[model samples]
Target chain A: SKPQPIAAANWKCNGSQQSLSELIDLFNSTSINHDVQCVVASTFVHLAMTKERLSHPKFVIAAQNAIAKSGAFTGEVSLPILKDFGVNWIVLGHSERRAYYGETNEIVADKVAAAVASGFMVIACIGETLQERESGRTAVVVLTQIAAIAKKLKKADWAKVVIAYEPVWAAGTGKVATPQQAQEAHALIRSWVSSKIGADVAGELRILYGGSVNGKNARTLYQQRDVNGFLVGGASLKPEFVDIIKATQ
Target chain B: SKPQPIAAANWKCNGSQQSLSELIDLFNSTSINHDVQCVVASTFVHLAMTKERLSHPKFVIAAQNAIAKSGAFTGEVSLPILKDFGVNWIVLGHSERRAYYGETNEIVADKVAAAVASGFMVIACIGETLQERESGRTAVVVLTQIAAIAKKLKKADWAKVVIAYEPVWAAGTGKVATPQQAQEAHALIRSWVSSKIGADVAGELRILYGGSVNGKNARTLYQQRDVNGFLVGGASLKPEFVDIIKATQ
Candidate 1:
């Protein structure tokens, strides 16, 4: 049998009050599959309203990012404040953040530890860039990224971690990631978890693939070995995300 | 004559539902001076609640920072979304951001241009770090930072920009910035703007002092010849800010 399917919608640097309301309406109108876990990562300001509007038992709200502790870190959302806003999940170390905002491996690990210790779920994103992939260092690069967070997290805390392997190279290539490629990358991540963290954690860990994933390919990607779910991107903004959420069924 | 006064409170990486509510309650209970402008820059998540709760005409809400445009920039709130959330003003290039995050002078200028282009008021911060100040490069550093943004901004857009000169060296040296020191730094910035931009714009521009500024010293700082207002720190989260807000009186 496959792992329980999860389709996480990441509205990256996107959404408005109007669009968010309409998207939440679309989500509320649809019936969720009880067996699957569904989460939505909207913008930070929208978290309060989304929580107030979307009453779905499984339509969980996630923060796109959050700093571990609070203080003088300006232009940042802190963990305690995010928790106060009714956010239960946080997406840390996304490729975009690591690429554009200078989130190094060490910084990502510290954030994951802080979020986990604060009793919040963390979706730790780790992936290889296009240059890394072309250099035949995909597995080496992705595993190194994972090891950074894995080392900082305790064994029990591992339960709170969901690894989203978004191959940065695959996106913006005007081509979809083949199911086989996603499965291959995801399996490597699982084996590394088994070898480093222990076999029990590896089998239970849900590794998500996020490279160019859309509604049409959601089911196929989910069906792949070790490709447990998706971190949905552009399609996550539209009514099309409903189809992706329903894919697990 | 000195420029019009503005008291901008930066609740950097701070605040929550309860604290923000209490702070807003505190702000509402206090009377604001008609001559001075008061803006509270809270965390992004609290923007909606602050706007919904606080109704003082002089007490405006500002986003701590915002990206110029919207899209795949993860962990970033865009200009349009901030506008949708009722943010009329944005604080860009705060030294906290430039120091911690990798927001260089060039990036800060680009963000200012984008926010201005999208019809948002900008509080463009320009300050020297402790080391730069100690190295006697304060004028060189601050002016260069200003030129980066000034070249990108049109003559008319100058009206929308407020420069906060927060001396990073003075904040943690267990000493307050002398009123004379603030005036000297403020004077340097004014002369730079007058030389590079225009005399009309320089005379009208509001340059606030932000180093170790508290309610106790706010009036003294504001009394300086070139100093116009303040960008408050730790005290901004407390009732003491009322005194700072009332400084111009």
Candidate 2:
């Protein structure tokens, strides 16, 4: 209860600078209670522009993704450079990157460690693919991801690590996990954190549900006891994103 | 050689806005005597800001990479947005993307066609991995990659598609490819075009050599008949980039 809730609008890869500015201006002016943290995880190309608009404590910019560190990688945004660009947070090891781009647990941990080194708070992401869930590897897979990050992050870093438990099967799919499913996943992650990183930090850290979270379903999903926020995908692109932030309030 | 040689400083995932402004100032004021087209490909976050600095035609900002087209690929940049940001040139199919990110030849071609459709002049890259080269498949591998794009693009698009042949083993390794190795690949690519897209269009096309290209070795590489220009990578981050430009001039 201490960490009220936080909501992040993940506009994965959409919008021009002109349009993004409009969205930021609209969101900044919208009436929302300051009880919740509102974040926008934008595409890498728009990081600086997003940073310019959403620099306030209430609103923040998250690098949708980043590589380990800054030197010698072509076409990969490094965590160091992201920090230099004033990026306060980043999303690491989403199911899409895991499935599509071959990002493994070790690689994800390396990226998480890299972000922490550059002083970036991470929305350290974990999710179970459709097949993995069917085989009952949901907790197993999620714990594996969390353990990897725990190895790298210090106790103080827990304040910076927002655990977003996104279910791969539900991501981008219209079929979202019901409230019970989300609560169970969040609870599992919280238990894992308590067992792995201490109960005090686990209780204080934010645990978000990210799988087709939207305006229509935010109220129901946010009602889950362990679910502290929503990491919205498709809904993040439009005015609906603001509505999700309002739900958190 | 009627077509002007083009060069791009691929700041690939490097630079903050402050440093970007400084680099742009250097790019804006520095003059090379050659009839050159210089482009600086910054991270997606800096594209809009860099575009603002483009007061005249002496320099332009390019997206390091972009998605094939608009609509629904999360974590990838779209070609249409690049045009909206006033990005004139795009680097497609660099070794980094192909090697680390699992970008296949077909995917690279898709991005190239999409970029061209969005009216961004594409620097279509083609190269063979060390394994492919060792197996005497350099010509086979290179031609397959080249033909994949040449088939997709029209005759008119040839002028816009600057061929950057970066051998995988040589890139980011400080092991610059020999002039003979480069000429062999470049000439082979030119022949592939002459055979497939006809002579006139092939004659007008510029084939650039990119793989650890730096100031000291630039002039010798520049002398190769098909090595029309260079896409400076690590060297591009330094004043040596300007020196390389002057050497070509």
Candidate 3:
């Protein structure tokens, strides 16, 4: 089988069990070629039902995040608990968790090392704000976060890591990155991986642009040299999520 | 219908799905004749299955906590989402959150107000540590937490509030509070409610003991005057949980 490009739909605190059931039915009924991999990181309320419905080839489920290491942390999903629930992927190091919730780069690195050690794929997320980009520190911020994790994680495990670059300013707000800007950040990430982690892994590793890529804009964004796919937020809730997944086709 | 006293077993971060199913079977097989109510809050992974198999009318479900009331708080459940899942009760302001995860009294007050306005039955917990108890400041510490929340919440809402006194030193440490000590603390909470909220609401308030109340000591704990029921922890995992329920009966 050929290596499939990846697309993830982060259902961020949205959808009830009834509506999510409809979404799963949409996925099951729709016909698509096997060359694309699709997954979703849903609220904990939906995982058990989502896992039951998504239990076939070509699709997977992930918790939004897990504790760096498991213990008596109330309201935290442990790595072993995520494994027991059959969830295979996770999103860690997002800007919202860092800026708003005080999750440090050191903590994010601990999370990455834990996920990989537990044999789960991780969508290790990193990005900067408009201020950082305007001040010309985009690469500095991104590389600092990447290097922190890169130093701790094994290069061999790069195959299981999918890097999602979501500019902090554009994430929840309607603002989005231009196709050129998205590609510039994507290429910078690719270059860093090639220099630090190795070229073979860099080339094979999937890098997804995650700054509010709606259906109307996904086509041009995926056409960039290094922007392989997307980690969609609001767009993932719509039927247009299927369109974004099929944009490269 | 008589006024019922509700007790919830919080099996925090423990138990597998199969074990949960067996416990639910034991729960459903028994006939509950008392006016007391029962509930169990388990890990997120077990919630969906637990909701499905457990018999209603005899038992209800509760979540340990939900995110601070809004969008995109990763690694947390939303109170609105828990409402959608039919979880009627929630445990708020536990020491596990306050001591380890940096949840402050102010944040917990905000959470309780939002949850109450959202129409949830709340078990608002309060207690002092070994140091405070030793220094003879237990009542002062406990009263401060309760007063902070009471300032925002009205007395009419007391019907939906269940108070659990979980003294920090005893919780999960295998150091059960002696019956005399348990009565004194619970009586203190009862008097605080009577003086501050009102005598009528205080008489009806269900004050529970939550320091390792297993089958061995459950009867002794339950026999205390102000100890209406329990907010069980580690011992909630076994068939012994049924025995704890029976002790109240």
The two-chain DockQ for each candidate, comma-separated, is 0.79, 0.60, 0.51
Q: Candidate 3: where are CA atoms >4 Å away?
A: A1-3, A54-57, A68-71, B1-3, B68-70
Which ten residues in a row are the worst by lDDT in model 2 chain B? B68-77
- DockQ: which is higher, 1 or 3? 1
lDDT at A81 for candidate 1? 92
| Tens-digit lDDT track of model 1 for B1-249 | 876799989888898899889999989888874588898998888987998998887888899998877898778899999888878888999888898889999999999999888888788888887788788999899999999999799999988888988877754344667988888998999998898889999999999877677889888777788988988878888899999988876
- Model 2 lDDT per residue over A1-249, tens place: 548688888777678878889888888788775688788888877776776776455887788788876765677777777777777788888877777788888888888887777788788789888899999988888899889889887888787788889998889898899999999998899998898889999889899988888899998888778989988888888888887887775
On TM-score, the stronger of 1 and 3 is: 1
Regions of model 2 farther than 4 Å from truth: A55-57, B54-56, B71-74
Top TM-score hit: 1
Interface RMSD of each: 1.3, 1.9, 1.8
Tens-place lDDT digits, model 1, residues A4-82: 7778889988888888999888888888755777888988888778888887777788999988788987789999998
Best model per DockQ? 1
lDDT by candidate, in order shown? 0.86, 0.81, 0.81
DockQ for model 1?
Answer: 0.79
Docking class of 1: medium
TM, chain A, every candidate = 0.96, 0.94, 0.95
